[PDB]
Amino acid sequence: FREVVETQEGKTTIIEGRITATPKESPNPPNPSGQCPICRWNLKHKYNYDDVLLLSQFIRPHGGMLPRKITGLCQEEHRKIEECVKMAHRAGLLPNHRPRLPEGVVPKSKPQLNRYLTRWAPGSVKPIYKKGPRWNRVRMPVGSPLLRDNVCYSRTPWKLYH
């Protein structure tokens, strides 16, 4: 990739960009006719949020998503990976891609609650005080609708609402 560094010596600021090692795609894709790296390796409908090995290749060092025109993914699969990365951080599966903390900030101790398949941000969810009748039940969303067409090895389809 490319790196940017600034060195200040003698009240003079110098900004330079140095090229570092760039990783290379593995040769001989199973499906060279594929348009995006997903179906080139026949990974469509075959990855989940816990597959951090696939997700780590499309994220920045601070956990941010990469642009679609850089990775080369299609719009359909970029959105799926976008949600899988969000659910990976919320499950604590990417501990090395934490947000950058500015100097002079020490995070306080907060209730550590284990979670997974978390569709929404925890801070932006209101409690379900009234479940409602059986025919009008207020369900709790689990997972993501963007992963509905994934490969299911059981006869029962994925239940996205509990």
Partner: peptide, 8 residues
């Protein structure tokens, strides 16, 4: 060195 039906 990957078959046509290979999946990671």
């Amino acid at each position: 060195s990957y078959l046509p039906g290979y999946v990671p």
